Design a protein around this ligand. Structure first.
Ligand SMILES: [Cl-]
Ligand SMILES: [Cl-]
Ligand SMILES: [Cl-]
Ligand SMILES: [Cl-]
Ligand SMILES: [Cl-]
Ligand SMILES: [Cl-]
Ligand SMILES: [Cl-]
Ligand SMILES: [Cl-]
Ligand SMILES: [Cl-]
Ligand SMILES: [Cl-]
Ligand SMILES: [Cl-]
Ligand SMILES: [Cl-]
Lengths: 114, 114, 114, 114
């Protein structure tokens, strides 16, 4: 495998930033089924509502969403497949939070971490 | 804050790689209290044995430890404090696993992810 | 000193990209004095018209400017001062050329390489 | 094409660091023909003794070689071929100098800059 300090081939910054902002808004909506639907078909059945509700508990403590900040792009080659990652700053009333999201080439989530 | 694509000042690759290999060996030992003791004093009380046992469940499915592989170094500046990170390949009988570890300047864990 | 795999603090990607494209256009204009004036005061005396004319000779062999491509951002800390760098793709009729430009915090050139 | 913030596949850090230090020592030896011979066959005809002697003039002003410092690894994909790069610190009596060297997969120089 490989860890990349930029996006892999086939990914582009603007598409990744735009999808990450939409996917964080879907996570903040508290709609578990819409958030689950943003993951690759093969990983959806690996997700739980309990784990999502634990994220919502921590999320509520941040206060109101204020703005999106800077993006840091990364990548990974795992089992000859490419994954594009982004560390995006989300500014809440109680402070800045760094989200880590990763996508497959079809732009569906493989990972989502607050 | 800042996301860095190398270690911050005050960290060095050899020290970080050596500590990451020791800390992954302590995690594989199944000794929860020794593993907990490797985290910064302020984060120890945030850890649970249940979360560590969930890691041990996933770890057991990998088979026997075979070797350490390549290291990828990263960093973060959060609330004017520096954190050194490493993505290290751990080769098990069932395949390669990428661990993500982060340290404070005193070389105690702030994050540990399989 | 430090070589960084991102811009240092005080530099912004969008500002760097705009200045790099402007500065490469000034270099392509064949106006030596305007190009020289884009460098920090301390480095102006170090530049020669002969060296700039050698660049123009190599530049003419590329054909017509077609487009700017992708940017790769880097940085450097040298004698406690911060320098923001960019590797920018310049697409000419005869092919792609990677320019390396570096700036001081006042957004004046410290380095320019075709 | 691609600019990478790590070595491409097929390159190893330790091999690159050893070759870069060897190649900088050959450059410092003032042996033009040995230095030229370290470049890929296609690029040898492009080198001049005059350009190498200009480097030797600047090199002599640095004083005695003291030590090699840190390495920063980069890469490039150009016309579907992979190139591994290193920015290596060379500490001279008069101060630190950052050399930029790039290699093809056969570990022959494609670029050498002081
Ligand atoms: Cl691409
Ligand atoms: Cl892009
Ligand atoms: Cl340091
Ligand atoms: Cl180091
Ligand atoms: Cl900044
Ligand atoms: Cl920026
Ligand atoms: Cl002149
Ligand atoms: Cl080039
Ligand atoms: Cl490899
Ligand atoms: Cl390596
Ligand atoms: Cl000659
Ligand atoms: Cl330098």
């Amino acid at each position: 495998g490989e860890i990349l300090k930029e996006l892999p081939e086939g990914f582009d910054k603007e598409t990744v930033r735009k999808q990450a902002m939409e996917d964080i808004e879907i996570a903040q909506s508290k709609d578990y089924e819409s958030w689950k639907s943003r993951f690759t078909k093969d990983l959806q059945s690996s997700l739980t509502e309990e784990s999502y509700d634990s994220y919502l508990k921590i999320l509520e403590k941040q206060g109101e969403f204020k703005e999106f900040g800077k993006c840091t792009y990364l990548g990974q080659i795992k089992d000859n497949k490419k994954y594009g990652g982004v560390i995006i700053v989300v500014k809440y009333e109680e402070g800045n939070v760094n989200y880590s999201l990763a996508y497959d080439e079809d732009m569906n989530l493989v990972s989502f971490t607050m």
